[PDB]
Amino acid sequence: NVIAAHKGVNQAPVPLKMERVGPHDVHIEMTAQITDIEIDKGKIYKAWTFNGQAPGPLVVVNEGDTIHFTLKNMDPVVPHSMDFHAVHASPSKDFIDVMPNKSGTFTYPANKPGVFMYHCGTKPVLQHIANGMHGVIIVKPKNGYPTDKEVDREYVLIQNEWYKYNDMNDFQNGVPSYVVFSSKALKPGDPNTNGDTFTLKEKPLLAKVGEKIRLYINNVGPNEVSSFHVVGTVFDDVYLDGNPNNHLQGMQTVMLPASGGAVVEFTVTRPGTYPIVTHQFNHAQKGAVAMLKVTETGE
Amino acid sequence: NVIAAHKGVNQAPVPLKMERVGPHDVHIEMTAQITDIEIDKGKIYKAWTFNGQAPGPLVVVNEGDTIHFTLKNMDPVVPHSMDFHAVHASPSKDFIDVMPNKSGTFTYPANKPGVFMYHCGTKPVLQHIANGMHGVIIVKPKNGYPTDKEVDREYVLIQNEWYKYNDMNDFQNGVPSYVVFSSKALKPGDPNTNGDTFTLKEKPLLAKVGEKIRLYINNVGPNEVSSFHVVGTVFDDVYLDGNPNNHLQGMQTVMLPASGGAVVEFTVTRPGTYPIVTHQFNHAQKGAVAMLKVTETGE
Amino acid sequence: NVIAAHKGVNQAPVPLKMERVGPHDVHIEMTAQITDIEIDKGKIYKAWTFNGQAPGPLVVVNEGDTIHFTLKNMDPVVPHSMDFHAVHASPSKDFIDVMPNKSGTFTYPANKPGVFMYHCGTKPVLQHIANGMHGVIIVKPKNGYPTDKEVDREYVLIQNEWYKYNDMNDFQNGVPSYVVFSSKALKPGDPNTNGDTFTLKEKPLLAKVGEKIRLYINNVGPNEVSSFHVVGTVFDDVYLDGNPNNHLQGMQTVMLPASGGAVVEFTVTRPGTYPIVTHQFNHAQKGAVAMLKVTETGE
Ligand SMILES: [Cu+2]
Ligand SMILES: [Cu+2]
Ligand SMILES: [Cu+2]
Ligand SMILES: [Cu+2]
Ligand SMILES: [Cu+2]
Ligand SMILES: [Cu+2]
Ligand SMILES: [Cu+2]
Ligand SMILES: [Cu+2]
Ligand SMILES: [Cu+2]
Ligand SMILES: [Cu+2]
Ligand SMILES: [Cu+2]
Ligand SMILES: [Cu+2]
Ligand SMILES: [Cu+2]
Ligand SMILES: [Cu+2]
Ligand SMILES: [Cu+2]
Ligand SMILES: [Cu+2]
Ligand SMILES: [Cu+2]
Ligand SMILES: [Cu+2]
Ligand SMILES: [Cu+2]
Ligand SMILES: [Cu+2]
Ligand SMILES: [Cu+2]
Ligand SMILES: [Cu+2]
Ligand SMILES: [Cu+2]
Ligand SMILES: [Cu+2]
Ligand SMILES: [Cu+2]
Ligand SMILES: [Cu+2]
Ligand SMILES: [Cu+2]
Ligand SMILES: [Cu+2]
Ligand SMILES: [Cu+2]
Ligand SMILES: [Cu+2]
Ligand SMILES: [Cu+2]
Ligand SMILES: [Cu+2]
Ligand SMILES: [Cu+2]
Ligand SMILES: [Cu+2]
Numbered sequence: 001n002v003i004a005a006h007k008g009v010n011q012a013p014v015p016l017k018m019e020r021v022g023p024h025d026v027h028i029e030m031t032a033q034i035t036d037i038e039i040d041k042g043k044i045y046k047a048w049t050f051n052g053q054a055p056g057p058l059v060v061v062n063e064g065d066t067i068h069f070t071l072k073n074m075d076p077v078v079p080h081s082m083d084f085h086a087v088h089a090s091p092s093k094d095f096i097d098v099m100p101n102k103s104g105t106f107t108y109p110a111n112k113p114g115v116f117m118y119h120c121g122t123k124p125v126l127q128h129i130a131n132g133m134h135g136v137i138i139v140k141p142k143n144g145y146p147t148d149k150e151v152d153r154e155y156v157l158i159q160n161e162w163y164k165y166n167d168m169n170d171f172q173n174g175v176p177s178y179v180v181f182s183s184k185a186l187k188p189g190d191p192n193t194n195g196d197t198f199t200l201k202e203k204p205l206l207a208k209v210g211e212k213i214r215l216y217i218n219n220v221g222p223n224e225v226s227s228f229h230v231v232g233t234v235f236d237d238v239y240l241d242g243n244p245n246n247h248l249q250g251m252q253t254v255m256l257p258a259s260g261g262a263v264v265e266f267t268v269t270r271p272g273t274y275p276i277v278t279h280q281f282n283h284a285q286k287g288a289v290a291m292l293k294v295t296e297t298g299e
Numbered sequence: 300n301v302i303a304a305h306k307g308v309n310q311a312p313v314p315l316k317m318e319r320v321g322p323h324d325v326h327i328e329m330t331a332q333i334t335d336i337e338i339d340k341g342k343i344y345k346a347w348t349f350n351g352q353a354p355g356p357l358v359v360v361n362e363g364d365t366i367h368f369t370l371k372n373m374d375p376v377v378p379h380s381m382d383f384h385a386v387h388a389s390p391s392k393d394f395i396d397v398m399p400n401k402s403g404t405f406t407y408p409a410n411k412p413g414v415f416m417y418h419c420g421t422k423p424v425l426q427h428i429a430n431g432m433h434g435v436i437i438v439k440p441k442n443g444y445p446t447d448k449e450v451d452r453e454y455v456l457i458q459n460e461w462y463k464y465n466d467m468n469d470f471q472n473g474v475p476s477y478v479v480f481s482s483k484a485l486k487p488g489d490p491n492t493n494g495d496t497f498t499l500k501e502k503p504l505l506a507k508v509g510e511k512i513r514l515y516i517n518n519v520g521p522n523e524v525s526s527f528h529v530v531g532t533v534f535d536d537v538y539l540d541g542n543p544n545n546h547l548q549g550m551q552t553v554m555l556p557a558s559g560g561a562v563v564e565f566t567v568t569r570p571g572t573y574p575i576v577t578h579q580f581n582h583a584q585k586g587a588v589a590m591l592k593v594t595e596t597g598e
Numbered sequence: 599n600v601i602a603a604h605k606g607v608n609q610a611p612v613p614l615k616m617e618r619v620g621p622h623d624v625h626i627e628m629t630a631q632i633t634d635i636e637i638d639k640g641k642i643y644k645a646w647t648f649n650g651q652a653p654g655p656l657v658v659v660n661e662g663d664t665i666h667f668t669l670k671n672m673d674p675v676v677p678h679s680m681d682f683h684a685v686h687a688s689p690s691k692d693f694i695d696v697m698p699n700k701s702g703t704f705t706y707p708a709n710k711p712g713v714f715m716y717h718c719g720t721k722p723v724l725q726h727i728a729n730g731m732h733g734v735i736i737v738k739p740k741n742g743y744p745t746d747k748e749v750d751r752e753y754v755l756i757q758n759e760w761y762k763y764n765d766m767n768d769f770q771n772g773v774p775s776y777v778v779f780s781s782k783a784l785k786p787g788d789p790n791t792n793g794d795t796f797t798l799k800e801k802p803l804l805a806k807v808g809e810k811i812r813l814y815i816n817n818v819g820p821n822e823v824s825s826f827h828v829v830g831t832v833f834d835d836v837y838l839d840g841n842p843n844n845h846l847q848g849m850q851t852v853m854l855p856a857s858g859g860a861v862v863e864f865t866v867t868r869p870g871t872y873p874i875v876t877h878q879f880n881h882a883q884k885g886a887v888a889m890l891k892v893t894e895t896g897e
Binding site: 083085086087088089090091092093094095112113114116117121124125126129130171172173221222223224225240241243245246255256257258259260261 | 474524525526528530531532533547548549550551552553554566568569570571572573574577578579580581582583584585593
Binding site: 254 | 681683684685686687688689690691692693710711712714715719722723724727728769770771819820821822823838839841843844853854855856857858859
């Protein structure tokens with residue numbers, strides 16, 4: 001069930017465009033496009049994406065920024081839209097469909113800090129999210145987190161599921177075929193990957209012995225909850241949804257609803273390879289294990 | 300698998316009866332009865348209910364009230380019972396079966412504030428809850444919530460699932476056929492509906508631009524968790540189980556276990572239609588989307 | 599699909615060995631062994647276990663203890679390992695496989711209080727956990743919990759699932775066949791049972807009217823979350839993962855991720871039998887109901 005007009009389509013990834021236009025105003029431009037992604041070795045999914053990545057590119061703004069967002073729809077036949085969980089907006093005015101080969105621009109404020117999902121909001125929403133149109137926007141708190149001075153390194157990890165291609169019965173009633181992690185870059189040099197079963201096993205995240213690591217995490221679903229755990233450590237501090245006031249300490253595992261986020265911080269005390277899992281182990285067996293390699297130097 | 304003695308039975312809804320008999324004592328009388336409910340267009344489920352609604356009628360009492368509860372069982376063949384999560388009681392003395400065409404009266408205190416499930420407790424409990432015998436009791440806190448002065452409007456929403464009719468294999472091992480929201484009235488004029496796939500899309504909840512809305516929510520299950528989210532906003536304040544001490548701020552999505560409740564508050568800043576979902580999107584696709592319509596006047 | 603070398607093997611349970619060797623140092627020795635357990639009446643599962651129990655024996659240490667742990671692998675063909683969620687360790691050095699008929703010793707610190715899962719960490723981990731190699735380690739806080747002076751009795755309860763025997767397709771893609779509770783002894787005389795559908799119904803936990811009960815609970819999974827609830831009461835105080843700082847009050851139901859723990863406290867006000875459930879009622883129907891019997895004397 002590949003739509004006839006998508007057969008043979010594979011649009012190259014387009015970089016996110018982003019520029020600050022005032023102390024509290026930021027322009028962001030993203031595309032909706034159809035891009036082949038290898039989600040498991042030998043298995044291509046012709047994903048519906050923002051900017052040719054699934055999950056989509058990371059967006060980072062500051063608390064109190066107003067976002068002036070443009071979506072250019074490169075899909076030749078299906079309309080697409082954008083819903084940022086970070087913003088206050090009218091869904092029926094500001095998260096509306098952009099037609100094929102057209103652009104739309106919408107403006108809305110991000111006044112809460114945290115780790116928010118974004119996704120396409122075109123009906124049926126389950127079809128658009130399951131085919132790949134999901135991502136994270138981080139809204140950095142104006143006053144930071146209480147533990148910022150202790151953090152040595154930070155990474156972003158996103159969990160998603162993949163089902164049988166564009167199969168609405170399976171999206172509604174089936175078990176996931178794969179559950180996967182991806183990482184998105186906060187700064188130049190950091191890994192930026194798609195949701196697949198293998199890249200973060202073959203090319204682990206790096207750290208050095210003794211460091212306190214912060215992960216910004218979100219489970220975009222579409223359908224499952226997550227039981228997020230790093231093997232070999234305990235979370236020193238957890239901020240639910242990345243809001244600094246929702247503080248928990250000393251958690252072994254952090255549940256996340258579908259679309260839920262967190263900031264989690266932990267210390268790695270010995271060199272070695274540390275798996276990162278969802279502890280719902282049927283999903284870990286179906287791809288959701290990433291690796292952190294901790295060395296004496298960090299390289 | 301409709302029990303022979305229920306074929307042709309459809310008992311009209313009976314109003315909840317409730318009266319205060321002392322500063323801290325309240326009488327409540329409810330029925331158990333068998334009532335046809337249209338859960339999706341064209342699809343009748345011959346539900347097992349309290350008072351002919353599923354979920355059942357809303358009960359609201361004050362912290363510290365003792366409830367003197369009578370159940371009249373109008374089912375001609377199956378016994379029924381009541382378990383309120385709000386109360387301290389002996390299950391084997393106070394949540395016992397009432398036989399067909401009989402009444403029972405039980406007395407127990409509600410000393411904790413919150414948003415509690417109630418349900419039938421007759422074995423097998425899964426069969427009695429899945430066939431419709433669930434509901435919410437709200438216990439209002441003696442000293443309110445810290446944010447009461449900011450709240451402009453409030454509604455109650457309940458999430459439940461429906462399965463294949465009276466099919467114990469499906470109740471145990473199947474995926475839900477429908478997942479639905481209903482609303483129950485806090486005051487005259489407010490919507491009071493059953494768990495179906497369409498009423499709160501066709502007849503949305505109303506609000507005005509700029510208002511802070513409070514929802515009292517509970518996921519009665521029977522089997523699924525919920526990832527509750529309002530599109531276009533972020534929750535300013537969340538009180539888990541409706542206890543004022545379990546305060547979280549700035550959540551995008553609130554997980555609820557089966558039977559879990561919350562009070563959530565959020566601001567609507569622009570006119571439009573705002574979907575209310577569980578963000579486990581397979582369940583939203585199977586009915587669990589309600590609408591909030593925000594106008595310049597509230598009408 | 600019983601491995602040829604396990605046909606006919608049923609190793610008798612071996613007691614946990616544990617001794618303190620310094621103010622902050624404790625030796626623990628456990629076995630990995632293959633033991634038949636009756637998980638439902640008439641149904642034997644040839645479990646992969648620690649010490650012949652599934653879940654495994656309870657381990658209790660103090661915050662700040664270093665554990666010097668030895669695993670003796672009595673399985674004649676499959677390697678096994680131990681991962682304690684309580685500790686900081688290098689997974690690729692300290693949670694490594696011990697071969698058949700060999701021993702390994704590993705040393706690591708437990709510096710966080712709480713109710714932690716332990717399990718085998720040998721690939722595929724889902725197979726080793728689902729076949730029975732799970733358990734709990736409690737790390738008692740140095741300064742106790744704020745509510746310790748109010749607690750009259752305490753018990754440990756663990757929830758797990760069972761699937762079709764050693765069937766990796768079912769472990770990954772199937773619904774559980776059984777979901778069960780077990781209790782592990784904190785002191786001599788307390789019940790110590792395996793995860794089965796019947797023992798804690800036939801031989802309930804005991805308490806006396808008026809007591810405040812503390813349960814240390816963990817949901818080891820492997821795959822499901824839990825909605826933990828005691829019928830007839832409300833939790834006065836909840837400490838997520840058993841860390842004293844993660845305090846919630848007045849909860850009807852406590853969600854637990856897979857591997858998540860809690861300390862929950864509640865008061866029983868009337869004599870009777872009080873069911874303990876996961877409120878995801880398909881799992882309660884498949885075994886996950888235990889009983890607490892409350893008498894005027896406690897006997
Ligand atoms: Cu297509
Ligand atoms: Cu400014
Ligand atoms: Cu693969
Ligand atoms: Cu602009
Ligand atoms: Cu789309
Ligand atoms: Cu959303
Ligand atoms: Cu940073
Ligand atoms: Cu699923
Ligand atoms: Cu699933
Ligand atoms: Cu450091
Ligand atoms: Cu671990
Ligand atoms: Cu949860
Ligand atoms: Cu019937
Ligand atoms: Cu009074
Ligand atoms: Cu319909
Ligand atoms: Cu009375
Ligand atoms: Cu009933
Ligand atoms: Cu209940
Ligand atoms: Cu009110
Ligand atoms: Cu289900
Ligand atoms: Cu389900
Ligand atoms: Cu207002
Ligand atoms: Cu949203
Ligand atoms: Cu075997
Ligand atoms: Cu000392
Ligand atoms: Cu049985
Ligand atoms: Cu030693
Ligand atoms: Cu093992
Ligand atoms: Cu683990
Ligand atoms: Cu104790
Ligand atoms: Cu499952
Ligand atoms: Cu399941
Ligand atoms: Cu006492
Ligand atoms: Cu209850």
